[PDB]
Scaffold this active site. Structure first.
Site, PDB file in Angstrom:
ATOM      1  N   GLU A  78      -4.424   9.132   0.023  1.00 20.10           N
ATOM      2  CA  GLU A  78      -3.179   9.842   0.270  1.00 20.10           C
ATOM      3  C   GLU A  78      -3.004  10.968  -0.747  1.00 20.10           C
ATOM      4  O   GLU A  78      -3.879  11.250  -1.570  1.00 20.10           O
ATOM      5  CB  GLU A  78      -1.998   8.876   0.226  1.00 20.10           C
ATOM      6  CG  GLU A  78      -2.015   7.933  -0.961  1.00 20.10           C
ATOM      7  CD  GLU A  78      -0.948   6.862  -0.867  1.00 20.10           C
ATOM      8  OE1 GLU A  78      -0.049   6.991  -0.010  1.00 20.10           O
ATOM      9  OE2 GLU A  78      -1.009   5.889  -1.648  1.00 20.10           O
ATOM     10  N   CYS A  81     -13.293   5.497 -17.682  1.00 27.73           N
ATOM     11  CA  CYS A  81     -12.056   4.733 -17.744  1.00 27.73           C
ATOM     12  C   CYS A  81     -12.221   3.573 -18.714  1.00 27.73           C
ATOM     13  O   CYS A  81     -13.210   2.838 -18.655  1.00 27.73           O
ATOM     14  CB  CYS A  81     -11.679   4.221 -16.356  1.00 27.73           C
ATOM     15  SG  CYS A  81      -9.978   3.645 -16.209  1.00 27.73           S
ATOM     16  N   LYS A  97      -0.857  -3.740  -3.882  1.00 25.91           N
ATOM     17  CA  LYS A  97       0.570  -4.001  -3.693  1.00 25.91           C
ATOM     18  C   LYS A  97       0.902  -3.895  -2.211  1.00 25.91           C
ATOM     19  O   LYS A  97       1.472  -2.893  -1.758  1.00 25.91           O
ATOM     20  CB  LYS A  97       1.423  -3.041  -4.523  1.00 25.91           C
ATOM     21  CG  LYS A  97       0.967  -1.594  -4.492  1.00 25.91           C
ATOM     22  CD  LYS A  97       2.150  -0.665  -4.670  1.00 25.91           C
ATOM     23  CE  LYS A  97       1.726   0.791  -4.668  1.00 25.91           C
ATOM     24  NZ  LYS A  97       2.897   1.705  -4.779  1.00 25.91           N
ATOM     25  N   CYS A 147       2.785  -2.463  27.341  1.00 27.63           N
ATOM     26  CA  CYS A 147       3.944  -3.319  27.126  1.00 27.63           C
ATOM     27  C   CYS A 147       5.209  -2.657  27.649  1.00 27.63           C
ATOM     28  O   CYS A 147       5.298  -1.432  27.707  1.00 27.63           O
ATOM     29  CB  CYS A 147       4.104  -3.648  25.642  1.00 27.63           C
ATOM     30  SG  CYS A 147       5.711  -4.345  25.212  1.00 27.63           S
ATOM     31  N   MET A 206      -2.562  -1.396 -12.938  1.00 24.96           N
ATOM     32  CA  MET A 206      -3.921  -1.654 -12.480  1.00 24.96           C
ATOM     33  C   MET A 206      -3.985  -3.053 -11.892  1.00 24.96           C
ATOM     34  O   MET A 206      -3.080  -3.870 -12.081  1.00 24.96           O
ATOM     35  CB  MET A 206      -4.936  -1.501 -13.619  1.00 24.96           C
ATOM     36  CG  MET A 206      -6.367  -1.266 -13.162  1.00 24.96           C
ATOM     37  SD  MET A 206      -6.583   0.308 -12.319  1.00 24.96           S
ATOM     38  CE  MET A 206      -6.067   1.450 -13.596  1.00 24.96           C
ATOM     39  N   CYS A 233      -2.970   8.789 -20.160  1.00 29.17           N
ATOM     40  CA  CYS A 233      -4.270   8.139 -20.257  1.00 29.17           C
ATOM     41  C   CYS A 233      -5.089   8.838 -21.332  1.00 29.17           C
ATOM     42  O   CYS A 233      -5.384  10.031 -21.190  1.00 29.17           O
ATOM     43  CB  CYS A 233      -4.994   8.182 -18.919  1.00 29.17           C
ATOM     44  SG  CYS A 233      -6.526   7.216 -18.861  1.00 29.17           S
ATOM     45  N   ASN A 292      11.070  -8.357  24.148  1.00 25.67           N
ATOM     46  CA  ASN A 292      10.009  -7.446  23.747  1.00 25.67           C
ATOM     47  C   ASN A 292       9.842  -7.530  22.241  1.00 25.67           C
ATOM     48  O   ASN A 292      10.832  -7.508  21.505  1.00 25.67           O
ATOM     49  CB  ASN A 292      10.317  -6.006  24.160  1.00 25.67           C
ATOM     50  CG  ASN A 292       9.305  -5.021  23.620  1.00 25.67           C
ATOM     51  OD1 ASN A 292       8.140  -5.359  23.419  1.00 25.67           O
ATOM     52  ND2 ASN A 292       9.746  -3.792  23.375  1.00 25.67           N
ATOM     53  N   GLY A 293       8.597  -7.628  21.787  1.00 23.36           N
ATOM     54  CA  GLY A 293       8.319  -7.669  20.366  1.00 23.36           C
ATOM     55  C   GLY A 293       8.065  -9.066  19.836  1.00 23.36           C
ATOM     56  O   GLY A 293       7.505  -9.913  20.538  1.00 23.36           O
ATOM     57  N   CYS A 326      -1.730   4.127 -17.079  1.00 27.02           N
ATOM     58  CA  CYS A 326      -1.791   5.260 -16.169  1.00 27.02           C
ATOM     59  C   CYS A 326      -0.425   5.639 -15.617  1.00 27.02           C
ATOM     60  O   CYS A 326      -0.254   6.770 -15.149  1.00 27.02           O
ATOM     61  CB  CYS A 326      -2.751   4.946 -15.025  1.00 27.02           C
ATOM     62  SG  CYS A 326      -4.316   4.226 -15.569  1.00 27.02           S
TER      63      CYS A 326
HETATM   64  C1  LIG Z   1      -6.810   4.442  -9.521  1.00 25.82           C
HETATM   65  C2  LIG Z   1      -6.703   3.902  -8.127  1.00 25.82           C
HETATM   66  C3  LIG Z   1      -5.899   4.543  -7.199  1.00 25.82           C
HETATM   67  C4  LIG Z   1      -5.801   4.042  -5.912  1.00 25.82           C
HETATM   68  N1  LIG Z   1      -4.999   4.687  -5.001  1.00 25.82           N
HETATM   69  C5  LIG Z   1      -4.895   4.197  -3.722  1.00 25.82           C
HETATM   70  C6  LIG Z   1      -4.086   4.850  -2.811  1.00 25.82           C
HETATM   71  O1  LIG Z   1      -3.472   5.859  -3.152  1.00 25.82           O
HETATM   72  N2  LIG Z   1      -3.977   4.367  -1.526  1.00 25.82           N
HETATM   73  C7  LIG Z   1      -4.671   3.234  -1.155  1.00 25.82           C
HETATM   74  O2  LIG Z   1      -4.567   2.808  -0.008  1.00 25.82           O
HETATM   75  N3  LIG Z   1      -5.478   2.579  -2.062  1.00 25.82           N
HETATM   76  C8  LIG Z   1      -5.593   3.057  -3.348  1.00 25.82           C
HETATM   77  N4  LIG Z   1      -6.400   2.412  -4.258  1.00 25.82           N
HETATM   78  C9  LIG Z   1      -7.147   1.175  -3.855  1.00 25.82           C
HETATM   79  C10 LIG Z   1      -8.518   1.518  -3.292  1.00 25.82           C
HETATM   80  O3  LIG Z   1      -8.381   1.941  -1.955  1.00 25.82           O
HETATM   81  C11 LIG Z   1      -9.438   0.306  -3.354  1.00 25.82           C
HETATM   82  O4  LIG Z   1      -8.752  -0.822  -2.871  1.00 25.82           O
HETATM   83  C12 LIG Z   1      -9.879   0.042  -4.786  1.00 25.82           C
HETATM   84  O5  LIG Z   1     -10.729   1.082  -5.207  1.00 25.82           O
HETATM   85  C13 LIG Z   1     -10.632  -1.274  -4.919  1.00 25.82           C
HETATM   86  O6  LIG Z   1     -10.531  -1.702  -6.259  1.00 25.82           O
HETATM   87  P1  LIG Z   1     -11.740  -2.470  -6.992  1.00 25.82           P
HETATM   88  O7  LIG Z   1     -12.690  -1.435  -7.540  1.00 25.82           O
HETATM   89  O8  LIG Z   1     -11.194  -3.311  -8.121  1.00 25.82           O
HETATM   90  O9  LIG Z   1     -12.480  -3.351  -6.021  1.00 25.82           O
HETATM   91  C14 LIG Z   1      -6.501   2.902  -5.545  1.00 25.82           C
HETATM   92  C15 LIG Z   1      -7.305   2.262  -6.477  1.00 25.82           C
HETATM   93  C16 LIG Z   1      -7.405   2.763  -7.767  1.00 25.82           C
HETATM   94  C17 LIG Z   1      -8.273   2.077  -8.776  1.00 25.82           C
HETATM   95  S1  F3S Z   2      -8.528   4.461 -19.571  1.00 29.04           S
HETATM   96 FE1  F3S Z   2      -8.419   3.140 -17.784  1.00 29.04          FE
HETATM   97  S2  F3S Z   2      -6.332   2.309 -17.351  1.00 29.04           S
HETATM   98 FE2  F3S Z   2      -6.490   4.295 -16.298  1.00 29.04          FE
HETATM   99  S3  F3S Z   2      -5.808   6.033 -17.568  1.00 29.04           S
HETATM  100 FE3  F3S Z   2      -8.071   5.823 -17.867  1.00 29.04          FE
HETATM  101  S4  F3S Z   2      -8.771   4.598 -16.045  1.00 29.04           S
END
Ligand SMILES: Cc1cc2nc3c(=O)[nH]c(=O)nc-3n(C[C@H](O)[C@H](O)[C@H](O)COP(=O)(O)O)c2cc1C
Ligand code: F3S
Ligand SMILES: Cc1cc2nc3c(=O)[nH]c(=O)nc-3n(C[C@H](O)[C@H](O)[C@H](O)COP(=O)(O)OP(=O)(O)OC[C@H]3O[C@@H](n4cnc5c(N)ncnc54)[C@H](O)[C@@H]3O)c2cc1C
Ligand code: SF4
Ligand code: SF4
EC number: 1.4.1.13
Lengths: 1472, 319, 117
Positions: A886, A1102, A937, A1, A479, A1113, A231-232, A1108
């Site tokens: 990460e 868990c 998110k 590009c 969560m 926890c 561009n873009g 958390c």
């Molecule tokens: C405790 C926890 C921490 C997570 N941390 C990250 C993260 O740091 N970066 C990321 O891209 N996804 C993160 N995820 C999302 C996971 O990559 C993946 O989408 C998730 O395990 C799927 O959830 P499920 O078991 O309900 O299908 C995290 C998920 C959980 C449960």
């Molecule tokens: S009890 Fe469940 S909500 Fe998180 S801090 Fe432990 S995995």
């Protein structure tokens, strides 16, 4: 590009112009998309002025006479297949060109060579021809141009009226001509031999080569467009077309006259974003405005809220912002009117644009520096472009114009300072409000009844209502969500719950909302919509509001101000109307408003205060949609405005989704009354009502800004009515009619179920005697709440089954899960085979299937190291793949301990933060990973609380302990598709062993981005859902973002099969996979690998406490304090048993189905059958738009290629063939080379070889050095290890020092260049991204977003731009020049040593988290002195030497910038 | 506030009186919370998502909500939200086994952290609202034209009668004994449930308007078809009263008395009627060797009442 | 493209439902394109079917005239928004057709629906 423009200053034609243009175009082959066929391209275009002498000679050869005036050539694409259409097109163009008086000179068939283009692009090649016409009436040139443009538009309309497709007009004018096509950008001069003659000499030239996502080429979609290049991509194009339709009817100008009527549908049909931008630009410039004025009005400069610009420019910018809605998006524009040539950037400056002036009166500009070969000693100035800037060339008198002079000349033309004060603000009306008119707040019983009328439970009024009024921000979740979708629910769900917010993947970069808040706005304007082509004072008389949401007092003030022109409308309908009362009420309102607006009313105030026992409230969203769309289709919305009062909106999502429909303001008078009754009960404490209301307003503003930045928009004026939302569960007709443009993939309930639910809730609220609000569960489970996913019995049964290691208990658990009513989409299908059952003793092994599942990444910051290592070793014990996520990882876990278990992970991630990304970290894995957008998110970066960052996690992430770490949502390296390709190439260069994968989240139209990344050599695509977990995030983001992975995955499969791209990339899904049935379904849909995620964590212990985010926890998993850590009960045997049981279940269901192996089922969508819920719900979810498929043909339905996809190699490969002794005996070396711009990522494969042979710090500094001459390519020295010294003579292209890891890079101009060092740019944007160790010495000015995310490196430069040192974390930076605006945004570690003479620093700094002062401690004095000494003895800059010389009086001019939270941790007190 | 302090506190039950000091009286063992200790112990809850405390309680209380309330003052809202789904919170908070219903499945309990004092604070938040008359009789606004009958004054009968009077029907009760309340007034002890609170509850339920019939056996004073003829719907709440026995040599002597008779006579002589079978009989435990047969909380109550009424030697066996 | 199909679906649905007839759902005809030529495959359209049932108790002839008006208005509409290569083969309750640019013999092997009993 790429996009670029060349021009001459004076304006004399010369062959050298087009020569250098074609030459520079011939060197844009490294950013392209080279494929296997090597012949097909994706579009390339050039644009020059008309070579009058050539056509005059040709027409003299034919036999006519060349007139004195100039000619005009029209270039057209005519249909080629059938000979019945070309005659029609010729007839049409001749009839409409001879109807005005001009004389046709004849046709001409341009010679071409179709031998170089491929086959697929040849199947749709149209026939190119040209006509010649000439002014014979003796009329002037401007009238000639206007008349030709009108004729061209009339021809286009007339030929569109006949449905004779496959016809296009390149450009019809007497000044410009365009040669564009779908060939390869390198062989242009071979396709068009016309450019090879020695007479095509122009004063200017534009060249462009695009990077298309999909693979099917269409010729008329090649740039440049008519009088514009680009561009873009533009983010806000959906609302732009609607606002253009609104403005169409209120414009006229005598320059067009009668033929004005011929130009009503200004924006055509079937074009990209740049096409619409181009048509609007052309139809605006043909009215009298020049190019710079139109650019300032369309893409306005970011209106800074400071005094850094003379107020005349501020008045001009205010006027331009009032007259026309902006156009956001990453863009580098090069517009060329017949008189001016202007190159400019967008509001934010997201793309690079650099220009060079020669000593021959020749200006060149583009996206790179060394495309066209320039002499070194004939350079006058090497310049760059920042946000909102624009450089102009005037050929009418031969004059250049930089930013300030051009804008001053612009603001000279009109008295802008006198037109701005004609309007007024709202605070003036608020301050004069008499302290009277207190409305008696409704009784508590009345409020409770009205709240029950909309099911607003009590948990809402204390979970996400108390913090918003108390703290001053939104709540925090912990969560994923397990509540069903809005359609499958049972309780009365608000209509807003059917709307999912949008975002932007790699196609469009999102923009942060916590740092660059100066570039965003929420201004609303009442009384401004009107003419666009004329100029007068009837456009500066209006009212301006700062926020689109209003309270009750201010709303009543505005109503009292508006006087006797506000018409109210009742939004209540009688409940006893009948089975179709809602349709009657909607028709009644949509007719009554159209009646009232013509009678003399200019404002429509939709109210719903008339709600009573016999009349229920019509959903405000639907009423607003219908009213706005009727006013749009009736050519009336411009004439009036729309203000809405609600009774059901409380959170930030409702105001956003209501504004996204088309309303101007939104007022909520229930929330204020509830807040008052809660305050007078003494609940907030001693916070008066005024302060609480103010904090509430601020929280709503923050929410609107976040949701508006989640997509890439900057100003609300372009988002209103833009319809940036996704609908699931609504009928096709309702959405496609009442709402402007919202794609509904599956048709849903119409107006029967909606009215039914509304009337049922109204009856259960008002018809009975209620006294207390129900508890309700939507954010946390309850007994009287709806059906959540993780039920207590489910968790306990799974835990007992995984502890006892019993298969019967796990089978009972799976049965318990399957025996629930429908909860998600996968509960509406049913497997159905046709073959005979196969005995279970014939399907594959358990390990062979176990080797597919993986466990997704978990940040070391959110989790405890114990569970991290436990999951890691549990996955590495059997042989399957694991993840790391990460937050980096400890280096000590790279090699196994004595017990024989490896704590190292098999997959590393590359997020937007790049915390633990060093040289060593990227060579201990078998798979890379890019975190483009998180699942739970999306449109946001990884968050982590302030007291969760302990010593260990801080030393791992290279950060100062005790800070709320917020990774930037933008990526700062992927701004378009080609940048993603560059990052992919970098990752494949640093690690010659493994692969690289990309993560995505499901949404509509994701298949285009999928096919785009498939051309970027990526080989594994991970499609997430919207039901995954996280560490911490706002609940509005969790519950209102994304779509279930069903549609996304089933559409990516179709698209990647449609372009023969499925067979090259794998596919892996995750998100909400619990038992074997869903795994088999996902494999049936077209996936190969899978994930487990939270399910596995339940086996770890868990308990879903959902706390958390507080480091508390109770079971001790998401904790970083030593107390709770000693409660862990995790054990890898649990995970082993879980995976074994899941594999056994999948084996059993597959055997019972009728097949033998999973690899023989992928893609078989016909094995499923949709089953209805029955007649108890009357919903009409048809999932067929997902079960569809396209026959594959000859290739396989799965990936059929072993090993990674090879990529071409740069010069560094030949470097390795010479550096034998360094890798055989280890002796010093010193090399020199002539490096060019088409060599990307120089010095990375050598870095990999070094770190595999020796390591990171195993060598002495300056062991091996490389002297490059000539300019260097992109991503210089990416991930250099300590010991390497790259000395380049010239200038770097882009992303220099990305991820520096101890090396040393120096940049200095050629010592024979007569350039003042500190007055020229020498590096591009995004310098030293993700740096952690090393030293950088520059010799010129720097780009934008300089040294962001630096961790431990040092850098010295001679200037900077906007957003310098953004979100810096540690290291040392010394800038010797002029820093830009908004410096050190969010800097929480490190220092900054600025040198400024005119005391301009206190005007540009971002005085939020940092403090600036004079130098006071002799230790820092000596440190700065030695740093400058090292600089001057390394690169030998004259300015640094002069500074070093006179030292007694210069340190008193230096300023020091230091973060706030680091005063109490510095061993050297900076004060006295 | 923030109610997440279970990391730096310790579980502490309300003030309990020692063993010897109770070996002579009929008062209760556990004392009412002080304000300070009660307010503190209300903070230890975790506001846990998917609360395992509620999923085990039979009546399915909204435990976390009134927990948060009592931890954030304003006991009134807590009392109303606890009464909204329960008619007799004192009985439940005093007698229901927390070790298997409420305090046996708290989320913090499964991590050796110990549950929160749910049952006793339930009793407290119910009783502390009785000082200002916050409890009100659930009488309907308008009368509805229907009569309904219920036999038995047990807990089921009392709750159903209260609910029917809240609906708008006309309720009539029938009890075989005089002092109504089912086994809540004759079976269970006075040291476990001071009959004052049960009498206050009976007075509150009577104040609604429901007519009562003390000492009315359905068998002899009427017949089931006659009840079907009089009242449109009679609710059965007879419970169970026919005890078992053992068939083996030796059961031909005297001094064989089952648990129900002795317990009812002890509860009577605690309240009144001056039954002669205690004094002028062998139902007393002045100094004898009183042994009990069978197990459970029944035999527990037997041996506790025995050690209360002299009985220098008491034994209990279980198979 | 996967953006013209959704628009066409919305157009046909908002045209049919504007009269009152109930719409049960769509159907994807089973096909096998390993028998047609190559040049025809480059222009093959997606073949779908819709089912519509009467609920007004309308007689035969009025229902047929209504279906005819429906087809006419929907063709005019799809002609309006500039989407070519869209077509309706036959919309009635008495007639149905299977037509294509495949070889005449291979009909029974291209549309397996006809091999039904
Ligand atoms: C405790 C926890 C921490 C997570 N941390 C990250 C993260 O740091 N970066 C990321 O891209 N996804 C993160 N995820 C999302 C996971 O990559 C993946 O989408 C998730 O395990 C799927 O959830 P499920 O078991 O309900 O299908 C995290 C998920 C959980 C449960
Ligand atoms: S009890 Fe469940 S909500 Fe998180 S801090 Fe432990 S995995
Ligand atoms: C801490 C604790 C201690 C306990 N202690 C005891 C204890 O000491 N003894 C015990 O038995 N249980 C005890 N229990 C168990 C508990 O009391 C019972 O399981 C429960 O109360 C059952 O009572 P009910 O609902 O059947 O009412 P009941 O009281 O059993 O209902 C019987 C009612 O119906 C009436 N009735 C019966 N037949 C007729 C008829 N033909 N005509 C008219 N009216 C009739 C009776 O007069 C009486 O009012 C205890 C439980 C706990 C947790
Ligand atoms: S008892 Fe347990 S589950 Fe219930 S609120 Fe307290 S900590 Fe949460
Ligand atoms: S405290 Fe005991 S009796 Fe009361 S609701 Fe909880 S489990 Fe039931």
């Amino acid at each position: 590009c790429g996009v670029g423009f060349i021009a001459a200053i004076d304006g004399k034609p010369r062959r050298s112009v087009v020569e250098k243009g074609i030459e520079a175009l011939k060197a844009v082959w490294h950013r392209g998309a080279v494929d296997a066929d090597g012949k097909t391209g994706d579009g390339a275009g050039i644009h020059v002025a008309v070579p009058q002498k050539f056509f005059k000679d040709h027409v003299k050869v034919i036999g006519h006479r060349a007139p004195d005036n100039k000619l005009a050539v029209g270039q057209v694409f005519l249909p080629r297949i059938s000979l019945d259409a070309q005659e029609a097109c010729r007839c049409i163009v001749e009839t409409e060109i001879l109807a005005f008086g001009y004389y046709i000179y004849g046709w001409r068939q341009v010679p071409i060579n179709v031998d170089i283009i491929g086959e697929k692009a040849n199947a749709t090649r149209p026939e190119i021809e040209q006509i010649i016409v000439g002014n014979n009436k003796g009329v002037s040139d401007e009238q000639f141009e206007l008349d030709l443009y009108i004729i061209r538009r009339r021809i286009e309309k007339a030929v569109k009226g006949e449905q004779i497709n496959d016809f296009y007009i390149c450009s019809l004018s007497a000044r410009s001509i365009i040669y564009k096509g779908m060939f390869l950008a390198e062989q242009l001069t071979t396709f068009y031999p016309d450019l090879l003659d020695e007479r095509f000499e122009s004063d200017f030239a534009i060249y462009h080569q695009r990077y298309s996502t999909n693979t099917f080429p269409t010729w008329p979609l090649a740039q440049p467009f008519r009088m514009l290049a680009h561009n873009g991509e533009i983010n806000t194009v959906k609302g732009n077309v609607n606002w253009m339709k609104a403005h169409e009817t209120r414009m006229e100008h005598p320059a067009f006259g009668t033929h004005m009527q011929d130009l009503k549908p200004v924006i055509g049909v079937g074009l990209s974003d740049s096409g619409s931008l181009d048509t609007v630009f052309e139809v605006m410039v043909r009215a009298g405005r020049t190019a710079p004025m139109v650019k300032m009005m369309l893409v306005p400069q970011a209106l800074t809220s400071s005094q850094t610009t003379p107020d005349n420019h501020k008045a001009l910018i205010q006027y331009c912002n009032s007259v026309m809605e902006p156009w956001d998006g990453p863009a580098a524009l090069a517009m060329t009117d017949g008189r001016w040539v202007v190159g400019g950037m967008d509001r934010n400056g997201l793309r690079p644009m650099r220009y060079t002036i020669t000593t021959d009166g020749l200006i060149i500009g583009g996206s790179e520096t060394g495309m066209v070969k320039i002499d070194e000693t004939q350079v006058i100035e090497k310049g760059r472009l920042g946000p909102g800037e624009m450089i102009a060339v005037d050929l009418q008198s031969g004059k250049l114009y930089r930013d300030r002079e051009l804008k001053d000349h612009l603001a000279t033309l009109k008295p802008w300072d006198k037109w701005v004060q004609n309007t007024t603000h709202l605070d003036e009306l608020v301050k004069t409000a008499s302290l009277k008119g207190e409305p008696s707040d409704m009784d508590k019983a009345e409020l409770r009844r009205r709240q029950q009328a909309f099911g607003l439970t009590m948990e809402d009024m204390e979970l996400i209502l108390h913090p918003m009024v108390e703290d001053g921000k939104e709540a925090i979740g912990s969560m994923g969500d397990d509540s069903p979708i809005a359609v499958l629910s049972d309780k009365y769900r608000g209509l807003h719950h059917f709307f999912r917010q949008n975002f932007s993947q790699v196609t469009n970069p999102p923009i942060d909302s916590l740092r660059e808040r100066r570039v965003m706005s929420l201004k609303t304007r009442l009384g401004n919509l009107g003419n666009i082509l004329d100029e007068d004072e009837t456009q500066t008389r209006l009212l301006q509001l700062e926020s689109p949401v209003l309270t009750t007092a201010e709303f009543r003030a505005m109503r009292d101000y508006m006087g006797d022109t506000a018409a109210e409308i009742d939004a209540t309908f009688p409940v006893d109307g009948g089975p179709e009362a809602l349709r009657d009420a909607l028709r009644r309102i949509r007719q009554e408003t159209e009646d009232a607006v013509r009678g003399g009313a200019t404002h429509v105030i939709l109210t719903d205060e008339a709600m009573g026992p016999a009349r229920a409230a019509i959903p405000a969203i639907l009423a607003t949609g219908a009213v706005h769309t009727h006013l749009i289709r009736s050519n009336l919305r411009t004439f009036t405005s729309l203000n809405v009062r609600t009774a059901e909106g409380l959170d930030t999502h409702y105001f956003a989704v209501l504004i996204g429909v088309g309303a101007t303001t939104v007022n909520a008078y229930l929330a204020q009354e509830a807040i008052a009754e809660r305050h007078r009960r003494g609940l907030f404490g001693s916070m008066p009502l005024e302060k609480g209301m103010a904090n509430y307003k601020k929280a709503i503003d923050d929410g609107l800004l976040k949701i508006m930045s989640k997509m890439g928009i900057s100003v609300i004026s372009s988002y209103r009515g833009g319809g940036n939302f996704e609908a699931i569960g609504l009928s096709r007709a309702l959405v496609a009619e009442h709402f402007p443009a919202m794609v509904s993939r599956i048709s849903g309930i119409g107006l029967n179920g909606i009215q039914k639910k509304v009337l049922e809730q109204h009856a259960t609220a008002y018809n009975e005697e209620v006294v207390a609000l129900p508890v309700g569960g939507f954010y946390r489970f309850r007994k009287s709440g709806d059906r959540h996913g993780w039920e207590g019995g489910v968790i306990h049964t799974l835990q007992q089954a995984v502890t006892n290691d019993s298969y019967t208990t796990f089978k009972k658990y799976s049965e318990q899960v399957n025996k629930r009513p429908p909860m998600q989409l996968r509960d509406l299908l049913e497997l159905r085979s046709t073959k005979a059952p196969v005995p279970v003793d014939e399907v594959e092994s358990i390990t062979a299937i176990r080797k597919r599942f993986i466990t997704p990444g978990m940040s070391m910051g959110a989790l405890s190291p114990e569970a991290h290592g436990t999951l890691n070793v549990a996955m590495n014990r059997i042989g399957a793949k694991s993840d790391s996520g990460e937050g980096g990882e400890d280096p000590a876990r790279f090699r196994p301990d004595k017990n024989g278990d490896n704590w190292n992970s098999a997959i590393k991630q590359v997020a937007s933060g790049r915390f633990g990304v060093t040289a060593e970290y990227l060579n201990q894995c078998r798979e890379l990973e890019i975190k483009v957008a998180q699942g739970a998110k999306p449109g946001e970066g990884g968050q982590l609380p302030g007291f969760k960052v302990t010593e260990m996690i801080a030393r791992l992430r290279h950060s100062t302990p005790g800070v709320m770490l917020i990774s930037p949502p933008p990526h700062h390296d992927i701004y378009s598709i080609e940048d993603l390709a560059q990052l992919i190439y970098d990752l494949k260069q640093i690690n010659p062993d493994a692969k690289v994968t990309v993560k995505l989240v499901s949404r509509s139209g994701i298949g285009t981005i999928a096919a785009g990344v498939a051309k970027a050599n990526a080989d594994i695509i991970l499609i997430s859902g919207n039901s995954g977990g996280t560490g911490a995030s706002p609940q509005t983001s969790i519950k209102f973002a994304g779509l279930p992975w069903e549609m996304g995955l089933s559409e990516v499969h179709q698209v990647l099969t449609l372009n023969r791209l499925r067979h090259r990339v794998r596919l892996r899904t995750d998100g909400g996979l619990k038992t074997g049935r869903d795994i088999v379904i996902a494999a049936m849909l077209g996936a190969e690998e899978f994930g487990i995620g939270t399910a596995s964590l339940i086996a770890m212990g868990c308990i879903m406490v959902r706390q958390c985010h507080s480091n508390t926890c109770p079971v001790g998993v998401c904790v970083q304090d030593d107390k709770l850590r000693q409660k862990f009960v995790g054990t890898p045997e649990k995970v082993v048993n879980l995976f074994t049981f899941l594999a056994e279940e999948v084996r059993e269901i597959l055997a019972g189905l009728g097949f033998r192996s999973l690899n023989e089922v992928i893609g078989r969508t016909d094995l499923l059958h949709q089953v209805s819920r029955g007649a108890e719900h009357l919903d009409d979810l048809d999932l067929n738009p997902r079960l569809a498929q396209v026959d594959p043909g000859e290739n396989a339905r799965y990936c059929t290629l072993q090993g990674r996809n090879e990529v071409p190699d740069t010069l560094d490969a030949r470097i390795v063939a010479d550096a034998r002794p360094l890798f055989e005996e280890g002796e010093k070396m010193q090399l020199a080379y002539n490096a060019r711009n088409t060599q990307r990522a120089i010095g990375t494969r050598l870095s990999s070889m070094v770190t595999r042979k020796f390591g990171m710090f195993g060598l002495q500094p300056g062991h091996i050095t490389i002297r490059l001459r000539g300019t260097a390519g992109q991503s210089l020295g990416a991930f250099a290890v300590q010991g390497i010294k790259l000395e380049v003579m010239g200038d770097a292209n882009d992303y220099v020092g990305k991820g520096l890891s101890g090396g040393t890079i120096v940049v200095r101009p050629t010592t024979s260049s007569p350039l003042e060092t500190n007055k020229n740019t020498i590096i591009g944007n995004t310098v030293l991204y993700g740096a952690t160790a090393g030293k950088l010495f520059a010799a010129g000015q720097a780009g934008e977003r300089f040294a962001v995310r630096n961790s431990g490196a040092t850098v010295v430069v001679e200037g900077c731009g906007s957003n310098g040192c953004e979100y810096m974390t540690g290291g040392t930076a010394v800038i010797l020049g002029r820093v830009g605006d908004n410096f050190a945004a969010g800097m929480t570690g490190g220092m900054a040593y600025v040198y400024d003479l005119d005391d301009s620093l206190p005007l540009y700094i971002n005085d939020e988290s940092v403090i600036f002062q004079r130098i006071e401690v002799g230790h820092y004095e000596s440190q700065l002195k030695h740093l400058i000494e090292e600089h001057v003895t390394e690169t030998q800059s004259r300015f640094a030497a002069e500074i070093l010389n006179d030292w007694a009086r210069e340190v008193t001019k230096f300023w020091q910038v230091v973060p706030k939270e680091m005063l109490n941790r510095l061993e050297v007190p900076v004060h006295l | 506030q923030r109610m997440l302090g279970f990391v730096h506190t310790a579980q502490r039950m309300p003030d309990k009186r020692p063993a010897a000091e109770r070996r002579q009286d009929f008062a209760e063992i556990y004392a009412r919370f002080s304000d300070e200790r009660a307010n503190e112990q209300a903070n230890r809850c975790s506001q846990c998502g998917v609360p395992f405390c509620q999923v085990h309680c039979p009546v399915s209380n909204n435990i976390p909500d009134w927990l948060k309330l009592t931890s954030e003052g304003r006991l009134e809202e807590a009392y109303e939200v606890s009464q909204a789904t329960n008619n007799f919170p004192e009985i439940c908070g005093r007698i229901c086994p927390q070790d298997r219903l409420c305090e046996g499945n708290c989320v913090i309990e499964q991590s050796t952290h110990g549950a929160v004092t749910i049952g006793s604070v339930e009793k407290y938040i119910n009783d502390t609202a009785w000082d200002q008359g916050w409890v009100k009789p659930r009488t309907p606004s308008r009368e509805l034209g229907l009569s309904v009958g219920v036999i038995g004054a047990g807990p089921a009968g009392l709750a159903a009668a209260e609910e029917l009077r809240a609906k708008g029907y006309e309720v009539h009760v029938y009890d075989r004994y005089d002092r109504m309340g089912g086994l809540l007034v004759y079976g269970i002890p006075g040291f476990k449930l001071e009959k004052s609170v049960v009498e206050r509850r009976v007075k509150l339920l009577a104040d609604a308007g429901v007519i009562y019939h003390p000492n009315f056996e359905v068998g002899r004073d009427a017949s089931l078809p006659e009840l079907r003829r009089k009242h449109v719907a009679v609710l059965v709440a007879t419970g169970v009263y026919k005890a078992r026995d053992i068939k083996a040599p030796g059961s031909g002597l005297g001094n064989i008395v089952a648990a129900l008779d002795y317990l009812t006579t002890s509860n009577k002589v605690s309240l009144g009627d001056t039954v002669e079978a205690y004094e002028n009989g062998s139902l007393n435990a002045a100094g004898k060797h009183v042994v009990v047969l069978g197990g459970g909380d029944t035999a527990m109550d037997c041996v506790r009442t025995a050690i209360r009424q002299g009985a220098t030697s008491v034994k209990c066996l279980y198979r």
